[PDB]
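Form P-L/3: holo structure prediction, ligand zinc ion.
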Amino acid sequence: DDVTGEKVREAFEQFLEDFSVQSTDTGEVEKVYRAQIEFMKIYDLNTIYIDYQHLSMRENGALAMAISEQYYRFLPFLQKGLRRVVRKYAPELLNTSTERVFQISFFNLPTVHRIRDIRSEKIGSLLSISGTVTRTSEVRPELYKASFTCDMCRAIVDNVEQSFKYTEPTFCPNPSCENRAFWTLNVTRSRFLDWQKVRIQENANEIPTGSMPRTLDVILRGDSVERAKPGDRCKFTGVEIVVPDVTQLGLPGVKPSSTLSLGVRDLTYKISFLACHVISIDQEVFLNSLS
Amino acid sequence: LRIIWGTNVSIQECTTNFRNFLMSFKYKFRKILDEREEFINNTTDEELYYIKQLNEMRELGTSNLNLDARNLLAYKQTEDLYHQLLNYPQEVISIMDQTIKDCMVSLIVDNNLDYDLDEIETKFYKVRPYNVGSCKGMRELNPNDIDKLINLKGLVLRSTPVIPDMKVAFFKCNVCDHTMAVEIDRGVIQEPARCERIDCNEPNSMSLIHNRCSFADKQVIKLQETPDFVPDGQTPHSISLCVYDELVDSCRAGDRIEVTGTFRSIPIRANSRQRVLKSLYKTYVDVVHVKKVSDKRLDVDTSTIEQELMQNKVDHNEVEEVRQITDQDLAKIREVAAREDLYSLLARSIAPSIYELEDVKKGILLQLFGGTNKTFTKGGRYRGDINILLCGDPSTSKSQILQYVHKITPRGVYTSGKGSSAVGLTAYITRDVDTKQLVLESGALVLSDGGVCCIDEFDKMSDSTRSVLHEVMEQQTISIAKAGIITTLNARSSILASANPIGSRYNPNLPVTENIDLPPPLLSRFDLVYLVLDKVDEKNDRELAKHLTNLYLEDKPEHISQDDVLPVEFLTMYISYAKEHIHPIITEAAKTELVRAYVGMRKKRITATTRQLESMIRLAEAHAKMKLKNVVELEDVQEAVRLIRSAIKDYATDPKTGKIDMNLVQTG
Amino acid sequence: ISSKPLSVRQIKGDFLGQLITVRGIITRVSDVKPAVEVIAYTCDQCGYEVFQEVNSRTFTPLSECTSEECSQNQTKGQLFMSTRASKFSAFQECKIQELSQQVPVGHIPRSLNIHVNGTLVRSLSPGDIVDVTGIFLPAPYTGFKALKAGLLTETYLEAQFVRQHKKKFASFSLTSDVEERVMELITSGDVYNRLAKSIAPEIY
Ligand SMILES: Nc1ncnc2c1ncn2[C@@H]1O[C@H](COP(=O)(O)OP(=O)(O)O)[C@@H](O)[C@H]1O
Ligand code: BEF
Ligand SMILES: [Mg+2]
Ligand SMILES: [Zn+2]
Ligand SMILES: [Zn+2]
Ligand SMILES: [Zn+2]
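OUTPUT (holo model):
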């Protein structure tokens, strides 16, 4: 286990629980986060808007630095912390009516880095990227939690959550099996997450002199899917993630490899972006929007 | 003894000799080596060179030391280090890195600086040698020259997106939740079967989590060879450069660079045949140093790379993007600007070999300076590029002028008519051999961004090809909408064009427009249109013949000119400095003069349009920059109008007919 | 038999393995690339250098140190390639072509592959008319497997010596013998007019 991850998770829980600030001149001191929990419970939403400045003011920004610098490891800890917060306050919306996959979509980050400004050191961190939507994919279901039927000692077992790579349960409903031959999925019991791969171009203004617009592929999940418009300037907030690449095998330079009987896997990757918050950069509707 | 097996490198001797060279290097030694005793200046040659440089490097906090090879050559005791580094760059460079760390620690400790030593201790100091011998070409590299530091130079055709490079991998036994750390050794990160600790032992216990791993940045750059010497019947080659760390995104496409790196050969895998390598190795060149700035060419425009400069500062690439100006050199710039015949001197220092084409040489210089790049912060912009057309009789030296401009300019592409196509310029789609996936490259116009695109034999070019010129010609950008690509490309390229009047020889009978034979839209965009005319003048022809013959007197002749001309290095310094610091503005008197000239001009021969006004504005701005002024004055506008009148030979042109009288068309 | 220059058509399967001289034009010459003769692996666990010979277009690397100790002891040493320690050779896959004189009536010229190796590289350029002498060696069949019927062999010519029919201008050295043939021309007198009338004497 990791002590730092659990400690940061409980610190996040505490900071969320005791979040306090004056609300303007009216509303007195409003626990905006704790009240917005039930505000989004009213519609049973699935997003929790974590403004960066809230996380940044407390603990002299140490919590914000920890979250931004190592988001990928901390995210499941934050999920467990949010579940515990729901358990302590406002537990009425936890069940889907299994449990709603609440989305933590950060925003109001300090700076937005361009596609050309993407760097290999900052992978696994949180940032914002601004580009032009050029190609979007379909809303194809993505396997997040799966139900597996064991070829041996046959039965149905759910809650075998899917990882980035395929995962199957080593333990069986009848333990005498302990075999993983043909664990079979089923439609009615597995759980899926909405998925979408959007291709973005570099903006015209930020194009370097004498260079082509570098592109990028961005993954959209949850309620943030099907939000972008082809040809619409949009900003994406999330974490840089690497995905396997089978094209860059003939490129010059040595290649990462493993040894384990060769026991060798050709290891190449290309950088992509998993996004959480995306925004676009009757006359009564327009009037309502009008100040 | 104790040498590394397979090399003559001994750690103790190499470290000692490099330390002695670092402590005891005097630039007077190099000047003696380079036959610069006549040019020696002990006012700065006696001081410790690399010691002062390392003091500056410590003060600034930069982590990269750009070491010169000939510096190692000059100092006698470290002469062998030159060959050792040339033959064994990897181990020798690591040794130099350690020696720099030790010597910097010693320098800090001896001076007894108060700040804590451990704060700066944890930092990798990298030495980036360069200028390691002559180019030698690249096709001549025998396989015995593997892993030897070499010097290459050429154009940068294309650059790949940054590719992450795994160096440290993170495994995790899922049941025991134990994180794993394995480094890289010659490109392999071993998979552990059992766990690192003694918690559990399983055959397939851990799983790789790629995101947790540590990735370094690697970018592949395609360079096209431009050797000084090329064997007969050889087409230009292409070598795949590989860069790392801060050098990522340092080089943009179209940059004539001078790259130093390590020659490398790598086995290549058969297609879909798992883990079978072809015997014939694939050769690629590593990158340690890049020399963008050269004294034979103007510096890269600051305006175009201004946005990228902040990103470079973030990266701290430590590449010399723009050459720095010495203080005494700035004083020399000021005194040269103080000269009375600054204009003639600068004009004639451009293409010194060309004879008696002063008006044309001028226009070329005014193009080289350029107008003010005004930035309308509300929206839109105006660029100070000036485009020149040279429609003239044959054998008038126009192609030579284009060649000289192409050599001088930082990012220029030479093109000749039918050797061009619409898709050939702008941008296109192509398939790389290595990735085997479709990529986008840059045409001549995009590669000429921030420079001059010398377009030769303009008239022979098709009307179809010339159509795309308008977009980059007027608003200095190209917006393509083709199969798969929909975007806008900023091509701030000043077009220089040479053409022959239809008939190949100017017809006195037909007007200027009919001889030039260009559509009014394309013709009007050209700021200056030069009617170079070859007239049979006995005195002028005699002088030209004498000059050309005197060129043939000796094998490597110094140019035969009566008047003194500036060094090309100093001219590049002047032009770069004037372009990048000074941004002139217009005055009320200049405004009135511009309006009056535009009105009087608009009163058959081509009719002046508002493009003529913009050309006058840009020419006045360019002239202001040449004198080093921060404002433009009415005499500069009058000079611009005079240049416009002289380029088309307005005095000798008939007023209403448009025909040219040959008696009055005589020149100097 | 090596003295007689042979056209490409006359290089039948009988001449395989011999030393032959083929006369024809050179059309395509590849760039010089490093070809692996023996590849050297380093196993740091047992401190042994193991060398695997390569004698084909392809090969396969190793996983277990095949030296005595790692194969014998329980220690299983990981071995890594070393390019500098390995053996390479300058290699060029040229391609000679039949001349117009050698082609029979009605046919078209056919080509033969040449594998120039070692220090002999860069001695052949496109458009050259040469008599390359080499060893006519066979190679395993490389085409489609369906067309294969038996142990079919693709053939090449490992170049040994190159003789240029027309010497290059850039390769002139005034050796004493060239000096004498030349001064004999000088002493002939009126070298300009004699050389002028010399070209195409059949034209009056
Ligand atoms: N005024 C001149 N000054 C210098 N060289 C000249 C001049 N006029 C002709 N030449 C020489 O004659 C040739 C003609 O130049 P070139 O650019 O090839 O002609 P064109 O203008 O037809 O393209 C070149 O070798 C050039 O050096
Ligand atoms: F005869 Be020239 F190239 F205009
Ligand atoms: Mg010409
Ligand atoms: Zn089972
Ligand atoms: Zn374990
Ligand atoms: Zn071994």
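COMMENT: DSSP finds 23 helices and 21 strands in chain B.
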